[PDB]
Amino acid sequence: YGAIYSVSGPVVIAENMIGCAMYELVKVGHDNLVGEVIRIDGDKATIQVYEETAGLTVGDPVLRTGKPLSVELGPGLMETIYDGIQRPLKAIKEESQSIYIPRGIDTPALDRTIKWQFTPGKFQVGDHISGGDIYGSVFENSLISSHKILLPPRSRGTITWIAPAGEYTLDEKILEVEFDGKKSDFTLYHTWPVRVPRPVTEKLSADYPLLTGQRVLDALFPCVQGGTTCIPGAFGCGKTVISQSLSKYSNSDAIIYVGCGERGNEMAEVLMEFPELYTEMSGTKEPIMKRTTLVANTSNMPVAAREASIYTGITLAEYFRDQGKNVSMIADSSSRWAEALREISGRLGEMPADQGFPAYLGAKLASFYERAGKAVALGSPDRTGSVSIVAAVSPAGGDFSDPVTTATLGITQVFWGLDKKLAQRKHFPSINTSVSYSKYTNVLNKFYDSNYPEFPVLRDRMKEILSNAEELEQVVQLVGKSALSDSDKITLDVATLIKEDFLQQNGYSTYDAFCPIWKTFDMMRAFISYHDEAQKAVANGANWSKLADSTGDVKHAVSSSKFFEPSRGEKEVHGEFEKLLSTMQERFAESTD
Amino acid sequence: GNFKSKLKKAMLSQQITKSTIANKMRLKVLSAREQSLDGIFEETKEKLSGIANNRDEYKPILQSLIVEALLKLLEPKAIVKALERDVDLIESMKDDIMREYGEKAQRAPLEEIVISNDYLNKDLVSGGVVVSNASDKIEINNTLEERLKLLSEEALPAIRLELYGPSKTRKF
Amino acid sequence: EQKNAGGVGELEKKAEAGVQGELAEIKKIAEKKKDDVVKILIETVIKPSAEVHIN
């Protein structure tokens, strides 16, 4: 088709590209290098090459693919490691037997050799079918019991032929439609552009909490299925705990990890620990990789790949939301993606906005983050999915004045504020409660009042206790303990118990790996009851020091309350919490005599 | 304490001499292989000159070189600069050279080719011909010596795998 | 120091002898394979391949 002219790194002026569209992927050279059109000028198309361009001759063909940057959506997406361009890193490794990624490699994103068992849906021949309609289910893994086959959006018509129950590959035709005489062939997969969000019937309000299993997150700074969360992606802060808890214990029916622009040896950790993460939510111990897809991009991966990594991940998450599955997307470092944007803008020469970042960085971030959220999926049958984005910002050594960090904090409704110092003191999960916040507290009032009515009140009381201790530690340090009233000592002691017990979750143990929301609520009732009983008893003239030296047994019971094993059953754990509350009330009544 | 400086001096200041001697020996080991390769190349050059000395065997090779040079140039106008000897062979077989060029490349046969009056240095070229485009602006040095130099530069790993087996250290 | 100087003087000759042995082995291998290498090189040089760089 086309030819080549001026080459300066990835920019490649083409010839005879009369029928090329803007932002259309093309195959450049005899090696079929991937690249997207950046400008059109008559028959000349400015193509930025998505990888190294050292060997390119003038005149050798450039074939236009006809589609923008798109991801192959279908079965086989689970348990696969991809880059930003959704190149299967594993399949590339076995196909080439090579340590590196060969230039111009074109292995299909989804495996075409695997034969999948396909069960057709309710739609029959002659039925009118619309985009998003589930016309079949495919048993992908044990965790994904049925990868429902969606009709691609923007495509509809009358079903003229549908494959019966059987076992199929992706290339084999599965369903056939006729729209207005024109005949279309649909297969087990489809490709959707990454930069247009997958359409939904209605974007609902995200109101069901994202139970990460961490007490601090689930109680004080709760995210929502379909919510948005920001995280400081520093090194020492235990963000691995957060990522592993979301990918291991959360409510999500799917996990998309997007390692955009990460270090070489950090992606090594991410790719090597995930295969041995296991879940019990299925009722049987199975790896989380059966439910998770990784998008892995070391910093040497092409700039286009790093920039498009988050879009590929969010498109996969939208695809799995459109099946009715609550999917959580974790971005390793959105600051690396913003660096990729800055490089792209610089190479295109666009005028900067804020120390080099393009004028659309905020617009791109807002548009990308708006793709998250609970939504009724397009087409029939009626179903509801949710995409939750948990993105980590890692600016230049905590320089949170970065426009990337500023925009992310202005868009994301939840900030979990990991702290370096809390990790130094081995206070995992190391959430800095002073700076962390959550703007989904108001929305989750419905869920709480439906299930745990006292949860918001206890959460606010715990917030007040911790804030009071935080603001009173300065007066302690400045003046001395003697200046403190008895109630202030109560606040300090209860807050220290909170920090040592409720906020601090071992995670690597068996009783603290997953603290359910009901056990968390029981612990909040226990702690708030302790604080209230101490406050009331001391307000009844009792000297707090005598009670502290006397009521250490109930304090120890509260301390061991975190050792209650959630696996013992909700009823059993609730009963033992009731026994704990009865015992603490009785012992306070005795000691206040 | 004072003699601790000279306690290991005989192995620290003589370490420089030992390392220099070892480096010289290692470089000589490689220089021997380089000299052997240079001798092999000199023998190859002598054999190539001898082969070019036989006109009957030279003619098909010379036409092949001319055709390849034209295809690299890829133009209907070309100028060939050959040796003082066998200057008549090119003139005699240009009619077939043009047909061969027009057959090997789908385009039309070369309209005309001119033998340059600037004859190549017989004392150095020892064979081949340097074909040049019209106005002598673009040339291809398809001389036997130039080809030998290019092959020596490029086929060095092949020579390595020929004289010696695969490197036992290179497991890959 | 004197013993080290004498040992270095002798080790220079010892290393020269070892390098001489290695070089003799290399020269023997080169003389063995020279005919084949020269034949391959001459065949490569004297047998060119037509090509066109349209593509």
Added chain:
Amino acid sequence: KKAVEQGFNVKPRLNYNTVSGVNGPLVILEKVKFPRYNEIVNLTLPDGTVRQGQVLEIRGDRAIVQVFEGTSGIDVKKTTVEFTGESLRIPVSEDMLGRIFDGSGRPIDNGPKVFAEDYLDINGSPINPYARIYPEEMISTGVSAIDTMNSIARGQKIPIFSASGLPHNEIAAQICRQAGLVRPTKDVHDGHEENFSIVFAAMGVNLETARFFKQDFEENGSLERTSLFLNLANDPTIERIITPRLALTTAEYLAYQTERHVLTILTDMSSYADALREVSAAREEVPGRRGYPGYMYTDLSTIYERAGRVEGRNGSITQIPILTMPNDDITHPIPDLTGYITEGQIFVDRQLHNKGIYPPINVLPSLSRLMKSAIGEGMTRKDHGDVSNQLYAKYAIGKDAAAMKAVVGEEALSIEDKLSLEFLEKFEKTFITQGAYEDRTVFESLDQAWSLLRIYPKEMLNRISPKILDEFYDR
């Protein structure tokens, strides 16, 4: 079968005298036939001198060649350019160790040519992330400030931040001279199955210190493990760009095909950045932040990420970039981007240098992010991590107590502070202070650290585990 090179083919080269213009460091050609983008070409000056050039731009029948060693003497009438048809491939072999190369791959040790096993292409393809594996063992350096407290793993990429005039070049020379593997074994690390190697690359290096590197490596026996890549400050700029690529291609070859453990020291990364900026402005690109082009995070990433250990190969690449901070700030683009891409950093402090401490490594700011993977029971010694932690804690306390020594007085300090002043004294001038030719194994450095820590009492050596403390401190 290895005999699959198929390199016996002969590729004739076109030479054009059709030079259409000369513009600074680049030459424009008017009638090139199918030019390659990054092709290396040879210019024949009218006086007969031959210069290399790399194609920078290819328009329709027009190629812009950026010429090494300037463009003086080139006329549009007599000069000719020969197109090689291939990019800057370099000859690689198992016996490149002990050779000293120019920044263009040409040997400069008066030795022969490389006698390639293969002409491995420069700036090779990126390592597949699915093939990488986490660094798992310590690469030794012989420097206590690095071995004990900023230990480097076998796949780590850890820079040495420094500034002009500080002895970072001598630190690099010492590391190249004393680096190796840690664990003692029945067979030495000089064998054919557990071997170690070093690739030293100097970019924009001064002639005096280039000669220093050459003489230092050729005399101390480190050359037989080292492939040195010298690039003088007056050498061509494109040569400076290609030098780290040459070094990393050699390191990739050795580690991932010969299965060696390769340490790569890329000294003067700031000079490479200056060269990169010059090349960028040669293509009429508008400079980015601080005059440096905005895309070098990508190029520094391509340089740095050519490291780490991989799944199927027993070899590994460890990189120690060395960059001079201009005006001594981290906010400068070069140290900032290197901190983005690399794991940790080693700091060379001017204040320590002025006190006569060598190496002047300031350990409070220096950090090895994945040090914990290089230290353990089968990895050095079981006490490595907590001894390093205790050294860091007591050194910070000593610095704070030195601040209070002139504010509250010596006698007003606490007993820990009185111990901390003398601990800091002994630390900086006996443990950090290590001779330029003093090779300390990791265990020698560890027990020197213990001898420094034996002054403190049991109660407030609190950052050492009580098991290790009760097994090492009390005798």
